[PDB]
Structure 1
Amino acid sequence: GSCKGRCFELCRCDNLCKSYTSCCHDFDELCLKTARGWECTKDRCGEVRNEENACHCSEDCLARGDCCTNYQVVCKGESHWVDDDCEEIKAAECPAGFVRPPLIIFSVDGFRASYMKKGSKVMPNIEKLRSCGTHSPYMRPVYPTKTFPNLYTLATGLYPESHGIVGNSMYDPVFDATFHLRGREKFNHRWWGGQPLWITATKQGVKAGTFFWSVVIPHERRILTILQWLTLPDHERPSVYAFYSEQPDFSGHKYGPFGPEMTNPLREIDKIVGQLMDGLKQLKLHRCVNVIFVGDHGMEDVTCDRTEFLSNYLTNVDDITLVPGTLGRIRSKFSNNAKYDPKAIIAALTCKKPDQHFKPYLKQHLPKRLHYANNRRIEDIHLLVERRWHVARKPFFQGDHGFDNKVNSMQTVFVGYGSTFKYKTKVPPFENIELYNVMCDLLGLKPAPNNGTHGSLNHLLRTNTFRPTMPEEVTRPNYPGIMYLQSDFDLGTEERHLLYGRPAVLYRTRYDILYHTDFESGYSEIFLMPLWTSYTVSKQAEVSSCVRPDVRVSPSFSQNCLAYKNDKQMSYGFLFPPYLSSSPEAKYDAFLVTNMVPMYPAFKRVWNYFQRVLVKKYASERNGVNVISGPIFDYDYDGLHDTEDKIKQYVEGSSIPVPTHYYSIITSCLDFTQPADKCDGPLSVSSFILPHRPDNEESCNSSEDESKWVEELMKMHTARVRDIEHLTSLDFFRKTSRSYPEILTLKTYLHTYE
């Protein structure tokens, strides 16, 4: 067939026909025209139309939507958009027949956040978008910080474990097939989970342009094609579009990120951005369209010499498959190999050499903030690789990425410009999982269920169609008085300690609220321990095997010491720490059986140091802190609070469940001139989810004093409040002086320590 009059229509002539290798004979001839380049010149103005040209400077071009983007500048005495002053867009100004502002997502592979520092000298168009619209210092990608997991997260609002694109390469045991960047496999829909934006738009009557472009199509052509689609009549014209460039990723890989030879790739991108905004301007759409400039991840210095080889750790390297590079994923090469021992492989990869540039984890043991476990495509054995290094199986580029998503070099960019974004507004860094909701809002769509926190980015937008509401409590507490007698047992405040309201329990159970001089708790009669414990340590506070029963609680719903005596490997700790009692009288409350939780001795080293040393330090640095601590049960590693039937471990012979993790949420006043308990304004929060492990193999220095390794462990396991909420089915910060959207922003904050 032929593509005459069908080039880039919505034999094939569409922008993906190369990829599926299926275009017409003259697709290349007709559609990928390059003649005379991409720029109009004085001598071309009002030319007779010449069909061989790449773009046009004829009088009829605007109507066809196929002018070169500088046509009006060169041929009609108009200004480049970038040369125009910033002017506020208080409402969308759209041509006749437009019914919503269109969205254009301008995506740049490997665009590291720091690249913005290069500034309006190198990137004048981008810098104006940034300065004039809404921006953040950076945007955090998802882990693995690779292209495919991050593009589909942007599209879906989901963690890779949920959307299914767990890596650029993956093996699915159910399919028994592997997915790769190169190959036809990736086109099969079976790999792609969730509901991406283009489908959300279609299902709700909003027409979507294409989001993907064959590598063959030049960037200038991608822009021209989008601009031509925007000239289509109402019933044919999409409301949402995406541009993509493999730059500056491609050049990052060749030259590394910090090079002076990154200046030219960055100006070539800014040129394409300028083509887009000039193009929009001449179609009178530059104050109609919302534009998102966004990257998928950053870029780090990585060279051939900085490679760890598994062959130098494992004697049986030929019996394993490794997904290599800036992360590692290991599985048995052969199906029925009884010589395959993952316990042995992990031990063989643990703290073997002094400078070792990777750490092995079973996936359930990865920091919970990475949300990287609940998929059959994620191998049990993972290697978190040190920034600047690769790992390969056995023994041309200066850059790579893929590392832990809190690493500074992996951060990427966000800018929103247009009628629905705010004007000259800076917002705090946020995570790319949150954008799908925003893009939905920008298009009047109801988002499909996702991992963004809808409302947390309302501060990016001039107007908000979506108003978040706090979830309703699913179980009300009890407030027991003395209902029992010491002889009963066979064992063997608010103003001070609860500063943001009681956490709401969002599932069916039975729990009691408990008051004490030093702390308040919500005790669960199902799990035989608190779901949370809340206490406040003032800046100027002091640090200095009794277990006694709790009168307010039936022996039926209390733990016993005998169970710990009998469990050889399990000890116990306390959620409110005796070391922080206000008085020796108060201190006996800290030894109640209702304050007690099961802890491995190895973990007690971590927990005791946190409670006895770090909490004081934090209270000293931040002008007091409020701490809320508790247990987490996540045996199926889905990131969600477990029901009883999922719990796979109990204190021996008992019905006391063993937690997979212990959390803390540590809050103070952002205005540190105010104490934590007398804070008028915005809050400051840091949180962790510590794995409750029977050894400290994760910490290669753990034979040293706790001051040399505990805090590093805790920083690695930093978390968002939101992460803890999912894991506990609790809702926090319900009674503050702040708006609920502001609190949603606060619950999504991650303290990174970078």
Structure 2
Amino acid sequence: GSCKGRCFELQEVGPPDCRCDNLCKSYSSCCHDFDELCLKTARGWECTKDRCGEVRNEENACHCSEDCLSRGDCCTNYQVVCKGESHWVDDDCEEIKVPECPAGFVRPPLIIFSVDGFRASYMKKGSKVMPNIEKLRSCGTHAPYMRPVYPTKTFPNLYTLATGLYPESHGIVGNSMYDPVFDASFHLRGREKFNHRWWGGQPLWITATKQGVRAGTFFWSVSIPHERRILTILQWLSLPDNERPSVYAFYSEQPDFSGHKYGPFGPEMTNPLREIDKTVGQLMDGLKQLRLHRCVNVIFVGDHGMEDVTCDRTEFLSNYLTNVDDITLVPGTLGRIRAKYDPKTIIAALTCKKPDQHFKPYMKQHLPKRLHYANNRRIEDIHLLVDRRWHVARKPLDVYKKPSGKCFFQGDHGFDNKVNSMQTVFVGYGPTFKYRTKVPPFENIELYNVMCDLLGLKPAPNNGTHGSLNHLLRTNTFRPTMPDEVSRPNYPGIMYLQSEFDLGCTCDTKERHLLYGRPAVLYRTSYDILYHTDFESGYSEIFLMPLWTSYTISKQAEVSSIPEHLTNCVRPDVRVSPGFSQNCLAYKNDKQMSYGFLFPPYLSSSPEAKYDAFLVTNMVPMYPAFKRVWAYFQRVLVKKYASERNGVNVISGPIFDYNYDGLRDTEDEIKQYVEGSSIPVPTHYYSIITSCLDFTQPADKCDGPLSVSSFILPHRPDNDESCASSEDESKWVEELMKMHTARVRDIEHLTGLDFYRKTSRSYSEILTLKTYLHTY
């Protein structure tokens, strides 16, 4: 019934037994003397010279007695004030080429220092403001920014960091959510979040325990001062080998709290940042005191950024909907709508109704695929993507203001995760991280694999690309290998005569076009390689269209028209059986479906070669509304990119994701066909556009690193997503494409293909390339 000698113990305790641990306050379970014994604060957190050599007083928050080093409970500045040592931050950067750990350490510990709402740009404040953090950043490995997941809220991003999973897979899809199977709601405040039923995946602290690596408790009741959290981690590090954890986590609620109150830009943000730096300094001073400052790996990481948002920039559903009292809204920097009613009516009422409307409604299946925010029963079908700096609310009455008329907050977050203000920080420091090294920005889903590597753990299955972050680490125990191709292509010659085709249609070396090798098909299927003067394709005899079409456009390439006599021309391909070709009469009978081509006739190298572009094996089903988008991309944008990037290689193709799980559909999952036909209708079309990062070299003669931009365009029968679509395509199509930017890895998941298999680059480098997102 007493916490004597068990303050912040690692041994778990059950009810009704009173507890003395990190979370006993959060479970209303602390022993009567927890606050007295474990939350001491007398004399503060810093030794002073007058305290050096004191007789131990068990009342003090920390100790400066000669016995404190053996007891493991000195104040973090004890050796500086009492033994003449230097603060860690005052010491010169020295490379840590191998760990320097006490005998009996079996691995270098990992300490995760997480900060809430730490915007990437805050790092541009001085060593003046954050000298300890700046030394970690400059001496260790850092990225200019780390990209959070959507929504850019605390619980989804912390749990993604811990699991390597998109929120739709780990289940924490918001700070609040409703689960219809549970018939219950989850909120940041309250006891519901403590129920294990909500939490999927396998977080780092569980992966470690299952594999025999002890974790310190990652979570801290708000009642525990930051200084005491640091001292507790330092005390655990002095435990004996059979008890000492290998992995630890510190969490700070700052700078998120002051960011909400004052916004991200005020001078008021300086002192919160100074206080975080002071806490980092206590940790590093304390590690140096224990001679562990060249043994431990430290990660300084944020969950999301912070944007300028005031209650004066709020859109109200009551200005759009006939009755907002038959709906429930998750409001704020995003919107989720459910019935408290008809979805199609609601979407229409929210679509391009006011000139500068500051949100856009989506059925969740139509959200940009890069958000990976659909495949979970907790994600409402109706979603509102809110413009940065804005809020959406149900009615004007939901906006609260002070008596003076000013809002209660000036900052918020939650927006689209490619928004610059939502980016956050990553620094890694220690023997296993690289020395004085800058790495490209990366997504927070990748970090779980790295933390597993740092601890010698086998990661649970996750959404990271293991290997894509090897360049962060000085020593790699994981070496990725390219997946073996599952299906091998056929190379069919001239097989049939034109007169053998049914078929409804009427019409009046490959060193150049496959620059990085043939894509590997990673599932069983039947497909043909087809060569042409201007493009190469892998044609699926199962889906009756190419899985991929590859072609290279030089800087000097000319765009030409489709001659009038060829406007409706479609030609049989004598290499491919009539039984494995599309049927032109199907498109005539489908009044709502037209077709387009994957290699564009506009980019043919000659009038003779243009006929190849009209082969039935180059044709794909396209809604007339989508053809406006695709024709502009094909006729205008490809040439633009080629002219800007010193040539481009393009790989385009279809995607089928009817169950919106981000993975290629099986034939049985396809829910729409061209009417009366076996021709499946894609849900999306992709394109991957590659050139030389060194733009002084043409795309086809690139010696070094590659540059890539890709897209996954929704194949929709209207352009309701584009409020300016009544105008010329030059006014809206490129904005649509930028919203639907994607990683090559995203396309690989959705197609079952593997790209960049034949290059001069290391596989590690290619994995980094495949996880790149061009954000615009």
TM score, norm. by length of structure 1: 0.98
Separation of aligned partners in 2, 1:432 and 1:319: 37
Q: What does 1:642-661 correspond to in 2, within 5 Å? A: 642-661=665-684
Q: CA deviation at 1:133?
A: 0.1
What per-residue deviation string (whole Å, max 9, x for no partner) do you get for residues 610-653 of structure 1? 00000000000000000000000000000000001110000000
Q: Is the 8 A contact 2:140 2:436 kept in 1?
A: yes
Aligned residues of 2:118 and 2:305 also touching (Cα < 8 A)? yes
**Matched-pair contact (CA < 8 Å) for 1:543–1:579:** yes
- Per-residue deviation, 1:21: 1.1
Distance across 1 between alignment mates of 2:341 and 2:88? 62
Matched with 2:499 is 487
Cα displacement string for residues 397-438 of structure 1 (whole angstroms, at most 9, x for unaligned residues): 000000000000000000000000000000000000000000
In the alignment, is the contact (CA less than 8 A) between 1:474 and 1:506 conserved in 2? yes
Counterpart Cα distance in 2 of 1:676 and 1:209:
51
Structure 2 CA distance, aligned partners of 1:706 and 1:344? Answer: 28
Instruction: Name the CA distance, whole Å, in 1 between partners of 2:467 and 2:202.
Output: 19
Q: Tell me how far 1:494 sits from its aligned partner.
A: 2.1
How far apart, in 1, do the equivalents of 2:39 and 2:318 lie?
Answer: 48
What do the CA deviations read for 1:79-111 (whole angstroms, capped 9, x no partner)? 000000000000000012111000000000000
How far off its partner does 1:56 sit? 0.6
CA drift of 1:65 comes to 1.4
For 1:681-730, what per-residue CA distance to the aligned partner results, in whole angstroms no more than 9, with x for missing partners? Answer: 00000000000000000000000000000000000000000000000000
Partner residue, 2:120? 113
Contact 1:515–1:521, Cα closer than 8 Å, also in 2: yes
CA apart distance, 1:37: 0.7
Root mean square deviation, CA, Å: 0.9
Q: Which residue of 2 aligns with 1:528?
A: 544
Deviations 1:43-70 (A, max 9, x none): 0011111111111111111122111100
In 2, Cα distance between equivalents of 1:315 and 1:238:
58
Give 1:316 deviation, angstroms.
1.3
Equivalent residue of 1:618, what SS?
helix
Q: 2:68 & 2:108 partners in 1: Cα distance? A: 23
Distance 2:66 2:678 in 1: 82
In structure 1, what is the Cα distance between the partners aligned to 2:284 and 2:295? 11
Distance 1:339 1:698 in 2: 26
Aligned twin of 1:342? 343
Deviations along 1:714-754, one digit per CA (max 9) or x if unpaired, are 0000000000000000000000000000000000000000x
Give, in whole Å, the separation in 1 of the partners of 2:747 and 2:510: 22
Matches within 5 A, 1:276-291: 276-291=283-298
- Helix, strand or coil for the counterpart of 2:353? coil
> Deviations 1:523-573 (Å, cap 9, x if unpaired)?
000000000000000000000090010111111110011000000100000
Q: 3-state SS of the aligned residue for 2:552?
A: strand
Counterpart Cα distance in 1 of 2:180 and 2:575: 51
Q: Is the 8 A contact 2:309 2:389 kept in 1?
A: yes
Number of matched residues?
746
Show CA shifts across 1:370-391 (max 9, x none): 0000000000000000000000
**Whole-angstrom distance in 2 between the partners of 1:141 and 1:659:** 29
Higher mean C-alpha deviation, range 541-550 or range 439-448: 541-550
Give the superposition deviation at 1:496: 0.4
How many angstroms apart in 2 are the aligned matches of 1:179 and 1:646? Answer: 32
Is the 1:105–1:294 Cα contact (8 Å) retained in structure 2? yes
How far is 1:119 from its partner? 2.0
SS in 2 for 1:138: strand
Alignment match, 2:13 = none
Q: Is the 8 A contact 1:326 1:400 kept in 2?
A: yes
Decide whether the 8 Å contact of 2:328 with 2:340 is kept in 1: no
Q: Is 2:327–2:340's contact at 8 Å kept on the other side of the alignment?
A: no
Question: Partners of 1:72 and 1:676 in 2: how far apart?
Answer: 59
In the alignment, what sits opposite 1:334?
A: none
Q: Does the Cα contact within 8 Å between 2:546 and 2:617 map onto a contact in 1? A: yes
8 Å CA contact retained: 1:252, 1:398: yes
> After the TM superposition, which of the residue ranges 538-547 and 175-184 deviates more from structure 2?
538-547
1:213-270: CA deviation from partner (whole Å, max 9, x where unpaired): 1011110000000000000000000000000000000000000001111000000000
Q: Which residue of 1 aligns with 2:429?
A: 417
Contact 1:543/1:616 (<8 A) preserved = yes
- Structure 2, unpaired ranges of 5+: 11-17, 397-408, 562-568
Q: How many angstroms does 1:485 deviate by?
A: 1.6
Contact 1:134/1:415 (<8 A) preserved: yes
Q: Quote how far apart the aligned CAs of 1:78 are.
A: 0.3
Contact 1:134 1:416 in 2 (8 A): yes
Counterpart of 1:709? Answer: 732
Q: Secondary structure at the match of 1:378?
A: coil
1:500 correspondence with 2:516: yes
Tell me, in whole angstroms, the C-alpha distance in 1 between the residues paired with 2:525 and 2:103: 57
Task: Report the 3-state secondary structure (helix = DSSP H, G, I; strand = E; otherwise coil) of the residue aligned with 2:178.
Answer: strand
Give the whole-Å Cα distance in 1 for the aligned partners of 2:103 and 2:583: 75
Inter-partner Cα distance in structure 2 for 1:341 and 1:63: 69
Contact 2:336 2:382 (8 Å CA) reproduced: yes
- The more displaced of 338-347 and 68-77 is 338-347
Distance 2:122 2:98 in 1: 31
Distance 2:52 2:308 in 1: 47
Structure 1 distance, partners of 2:69, 2:157, is 36
State the alpha-carbon separation in 2 of the partners of residues 122 and 249 from structure 1.
17
Query: Please, which of 209, 212, 224 is the counterpart of residue 217 of structure 1?
Result: 224
* C-alpha contact (below 8 Å) 1:63/1:231 kept by paired residues: no
Deviation string, structure 1 residues 633-680 (Cα, Å, up to 9, x no partner):
000000000001110000000000000000000000000000000000
Distance in 1 (alpha carbons) for counterparts of 2:145 and 2:314: 29
Q: How far apart are the structure 2 equivalents of 1:114 and 1:389?
A: 20
Offset at 1:575? 0.2
SS in 1 for 2:630: helix
Q: Distance in 1 between matches of 2:306 and 2:68?
A: 40
State how far apart, in whole Å, the 2-side matches of 1:408 and 1:8 are. Answer: 39
3-state SS, counterpart of residue 467 of structure 2: coil
| Structure 1 runs of 4+ with >2 Å offset | none
Partners of 2:768 and 2:114 in 1: how far apart? 24
Equivalent residues in 2 for 1:63-462 (5 A)? 63-331=70-338, 340-395=341-396, 397-462=409-474
Q: Following the alignment from structure 1 to structure 2, what is the Cα–Cα distance between the partners of residues 65 and 476?
A: 63
Q: Given the two structures, how large is their TM-score scaled by the length of structure 2? A: 0.96
Does the 8 Å CA contact 1:436/1:447 hold for their aligned counterparts? Answer: yes
Q: How much has 1:339 moved relative to structure 2?
A: 11
- 1:300·1:401 contact (CA, 8 Å) conserved in 2? yes
SS at match of 2:424: coil
Q: Which residue of 2 aligns with 1:603?
A: 626
Contact persistence 2:307–2:411 (CA under 8 A)? yes
1:663 pairs with one of 660, 683, 686 = 686
